Design an enzyme around this catalytic site. Structure first.
Site, short mmCIF file in Angstrom:
data_model
loop_
_atom_site.label_atom_id
_atom_site.label_comp_id
_atom_site.label_asym_id
_atom_site.label_seq_id
_atom_site.Cartn_x
_atom_site.Cartn_y
_atom_site.Cartn_z
N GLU A 33 -10.55 -8.36 1.67
CA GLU A 33 -10.70 -9.79 1.89
C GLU A 33 -11.61 -10.15 3.07
OE1 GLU A 33 -6.42 -10.11 2.31
OE2 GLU A 33 -6.27 -11.20 0.42
N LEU A 89 2.32 -11.59 -3.91
CA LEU A 89 3.40 -10.60 -3.97
C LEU A 89 3.89 -10.36 -5.39
CD1 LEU A 89 5.47 -11.90 -0.94
CD2 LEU A 89 3.88 -9.98 -0.98
N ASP A 101 0.83 -1.20 0.00
CA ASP A 101 0.00 0.00 0.00
C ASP A 101 0.87 1.26 0.00
OD1 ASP A 101 -2.80 -1.14 2.12
OD2 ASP A 101 -2.03 -1.80 0.16
N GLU A 152 -5.17 -14.65 -7.58
CA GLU A 152 -4.21 -13.56 -7.77
C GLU A 152 -2.91 -13.97 -7.11
OE1 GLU A 152 -5.93 -10.52 -5.30
OE2 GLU A 152 -7.50 -10.03 -6.75
N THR A 204 -6.27 -15.15 -3.02
CA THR A 204 -5.19 -14.19 -3.23
C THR A 204 -3.72 -14.59 -2.99
OG1 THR A 204 -5.57 -13.24 -1.03
CG2 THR A 204 -6.81 -12.30 -2.85
O1 LIG Z 1 -5.85 -3.51 -5.54
C1 LIG Z 1 -6.44 -4.64 -4.91
C2 LIG Z 1 -6.00 -4.76 -3.46
O2 LIG Z 1 -4.56 -4.90 -3.46
C3 LIG Z 1 -3.95 -5.00 -2.16
O3 LIG Z 1 -4.36 -6.15 -1.46
C4 LIG Z 1 -3.98 -7.42 -2.02
C5 LIG Z 1 -2.67 -7.90 -1.36
O4 LIG Z 1 -1.60 -7.03 -1.72
C6 LIG Z 1 -2.33 -9.34 -1.80
O5 LIG Z 1 -1.22 -9.81 -1.05
C7 LIG Z 1 -3.52 -10.27 -1.57
O6 LIG Z 1 -3.79 -10.36 -0.20
O7 LIG Z 1 -4.69 -9.76 -2.23
C8 LIG Z 1 -5.09 -8.45 -1.74
C9 LIG Z 1 -6.43 -8.11 -2.36
O8 LIG Z 1 -6.36 -8.08 -3.78
C10 LIG Z 1 -4.29 -3.76 -1.34
O9 LIG Z 1 -3.69 -3.86 -0.05
C11 LIG Z 1 -5.81 -3.65 -1.21
O10 LIG Z 1 -6.16 -2.52 -0.43
C12 LIG Z 1 -6.43 -3.55 -2.61
O11 LIG Z 1 -7.85 -3.52 -2.50
O1 LIG Z 2 1.77 -9.03 4.88
C1 LIG Z 2 1.10 -10.17 4.36
C2 LIG Z 2 2.05 -11.07 3.60
O2 LIG Z 2 3.11 -11.44 4.51
C3 LIG Z 2 4.14 -12.26 3.95
O3 LIG Z 2 4.92 -11.58 3.00
C4 LIG Z 2 6.27 -11.34 3.42
C5 LIG Z 2 7.24 -12.02 2.45
O4 LIG Z 2 7.09 -13.43 2.53
C6 LIG Z 2 8.69 -11.63 2.78
O5 LIG Z 2 9.56 -12.15 1.77
C7 LIG Z 2 8.82 -10.10 2.85
O6 LIG Z 2 10.11 -9.76 3.24
O7 LIG Z 2 7.91 -9.57 3.82
C8 LIG Z 2 6.53 -9.83 3.47
C9 LIG Z 2 5.67 -9.13 4.51
O8 LIG Z 2 5.11 -7.93 3.99
C10 LIG Z 2 3.56 -13.54 3.33
O9 LIG Z 2 4.58 -14.23 2.62
C11 LIG Z 2 2.41 -13.23 2.37
O10 LIG Z 2 1.81 -14.44 1.94
C12 LIG Z 2 1.37 -12.34 3.06
O11 LIG Z 2 0.35 -11.98 2.14
#
Ligand SMILES: OC[C@H]1O[C@H](O[C@H]2[C@H](O)[C@@H](O)[C@@H](O)O[C@@H]2CO)[C@H](O)[C@@H](O)[C@@H]1O
Ligand SMILES: OC[C@H]1O[C@H](O[C@H]2[C@H](O)[C@@H](O)[C@H](O)O[C@@H]2CO)[C@H](O)[C@@H](O)[C@@H]1O
Length: 490
Positions: A181, A378, A96, A375, A337
């Site tokens: 979510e 990361l 974000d 989706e 996701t």
């Molecule tokens: O733009 C869609 C959505 O993106 C982000 O949330 C993602 C998140 O980054 C992923 O790791 C996974 O959890 O799917 C989420 C939902 O798509 C934003 O943080 C979120 O505010 C935004 O709606």
């Molecule tokens: O914040 C939710 C996500 O946390 C982890 O992501 C880690 C990632 O594995 C690590 O390499 C990086 O350094 O930090 C991020 C934290 O922002 C989980 O791996 C994800 O599945 C989660 O969505």
């Protein structure tokens, strides 16, 4: 015909394409990028339609002008759209890069009633989403939280009627919590949480606390209290009394709590989906929700991270299929996701099983006969990530004599950025798109690959909680190939 193996690819637009002042900042800049996507064969894009931007001024004071300009441009570029009803804040989660709070007027009410926000045991209030506890509390200038969400979607439908009729919008993703979510904000970076902390239960606002206390009394145990031995955000399960071997999570008290805690999310999603169905009834669009992929601690008996987030999933209790069954009455899509990850990419002490988690969730969905989309969690630009996504998209490969027995309804890639359009990265992305399309050229008419969109019909009758929970029965997942037959290569 191969086209039946075609899985559409969508790309998320940048966060903040329309700023917090409700202004579509760079149309010319976006246009060039969108045209790039069109040439690459991308089927569509996904965008957040932020509640905090549109109903900022006051109750039912909607301004859809900037978003009408954005949709118009998307249409001119020959792309379809996945619209997210984003009732959450942008800013406190991973990736974000812009701050977009929920409506200021709602925040104003929160100044006098702090309990409208998710609250942890320590009493910290999280302002990114309104607690499920106030879903039906008429405390927002006469409206309940659900009525607010409902009015928002109805206004969207009427003010964007021309785009809906012209078939620009493919599906409506209904935001149901943090990051859109359906989950509790158990792992807030804004409060110091760091992977792979187990996170914390977020059921301490006065509304949820009262509901729980009333619940335990009716169960014959008025003395039961919310968890007090679950530890803190960054703890490891074995150091807590709640998640350790033979801990509280395994007692009658613990089981009752976890059931209650997870059921709140099921009802939250079901009720809001009812409103979404009413708002878009008749429109040629599909409804969808997002489920988070919490893979850490998935490989130990306690599944701590999942539990604190609201997914009561254990080795002998399926906490995801019940959600899938709930979506069936709404003919909705389950969007997972986290699809690009491999177990070997995770630190050993995190006990991560993203691959196994994906298999459980997707199988659960196909088992209940609903459509499953996904989706990547990361940002990834490498072939290994794309090949894992393609594998999950068609677990058993392509069928040369018809449609594959198993396939996802679509995949949305996070996210559009200058990094993606870099020659080398974009070059690999193009191969990813081609392989998702099963080596076929971009196909403009979804009907050709059996993705025809019919007018949204009213949801089927309410499914009682006991029937939903029958889906907790563990089932063996569908067979997965060790690697895809449609590799991008390198
Ligand atoms: O733009 C869609 C959505 O993106 C982000 O949330 C993602 C998140 O980054 C992923 O790791 C996974 O959890 O799917 C989420 C939902 O798509 C934003 O943080 C979120 O505010 C935004 O709606
Ligand atoms: O914040 C939710 C996500 O946390 C982890 O992501 C880690 C990632 O594995 C690590 O390499 C990086 O350094 O930090 C991020 C934290 O922002 C989980 O791996 C994800 O599945 C989660 O969505």
């Amino acid at each position: 015909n191969m086209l039946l193996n075609y899985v559409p690819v969508y790309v998320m637009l940048p966060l903040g394409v329309v700023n917090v002042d409700n202004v579509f900042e760079d149309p010319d800049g976006l246009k060039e990028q969108l045209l790039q996507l069109r040439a690459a064969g991308v089927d569509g894009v996904m965008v957040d339609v932020w509640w905090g931007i549109i109903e900022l001024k006051g109750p039912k004071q909607y301004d859809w002008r900037a978003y009408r300009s954005l949709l118009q441009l998307v249409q001119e570029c020959g792309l379809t759209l996945q619209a997210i009803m984003s009732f959450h804040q942008c800013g406190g989660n991973v990736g974000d890069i812009v701050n977009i709070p929920i409506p200021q007027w709602v925040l104003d009410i929160g100044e006098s009633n702090h309990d409208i926000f998710y609250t942890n045991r320590s009493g910290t209030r999280n302002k990114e989403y309104l607690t499920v506890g106030v879903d039906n509390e008429p405390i927002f200038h006469g409206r309940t939280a659900i009525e607010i969400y409902s009015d928002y979607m109805k206004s969207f439908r009427e003010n964007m009627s021309d785009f809906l009729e012209s078939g620009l919008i493919i599906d409506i993703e209904v935001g149901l919590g943090p990051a859109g979510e359906l989950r509790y904000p158990s792992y807030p970076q804004s409060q110091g949480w760091e992977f792979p902390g187990i996170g914390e239960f977020q059921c301490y606002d006065k509304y949820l606390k009262a509901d729980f206390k009333a619940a335990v009394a009716r169960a014959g145990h008025p003395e039961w209290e919310l968890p007090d031995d679950a530890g803190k955000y960054n703890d490891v399960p074995e150091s807590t009394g709640f998640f350790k071997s033979n801990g509280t999570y395994v007692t009658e008290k613990g089981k009752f709590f976890l059931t209650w805690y997870s059921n709140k999310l099921l009802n939250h999603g079901d009720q809001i989906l009812d409103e979404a169905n009413k708002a878009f009834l008749g429109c040629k669009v599909k409804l969808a929700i997002k489920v988070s992929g919490i893979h850490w601690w998935y490989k130990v008996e306690n599944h701590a991270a999942e539990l604190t987030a609201g997914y009561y999933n254990l080795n002998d209790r399926d906490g995801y299929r019940p959600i899938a069954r709930m979506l069936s009455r709404h003919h909705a899509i389950l969007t997972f996701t986290c699809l690009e990850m491999r177990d070997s990419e995770q630190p050993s002490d995190a006990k991560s099983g993203p691959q196994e988690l994906v298999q459980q969730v997707l199988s659960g969905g196909w088992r209940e006969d609903i459509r499953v989309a996904g989706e990547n969690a990361l940002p990834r630009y490498d072939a290994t990530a794309y090949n894992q996504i393609i594998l999950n998209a068609r677990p058993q490969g392509v069928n040369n004599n018809g449609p594959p027995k198993l396939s996802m309804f679509g995949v949305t890639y996070l996210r559009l950025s200058d990094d993606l359009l870099q020659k080398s990265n974009f070059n690999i992305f193009k191969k990813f798109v081609l392989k998702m399309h099963a080596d076929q050229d971009y196909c403009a008419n979804p009907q050709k690959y059996n993705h025809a969109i019919t007018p949204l019909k009213p949801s089927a009758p309410k499914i009682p909680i006991e029937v939903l929970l029958e889906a907790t029965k563990p089932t063996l997942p569908f067979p997965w190939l060790p690697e895809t037959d449609m590799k991008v290569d390198g």
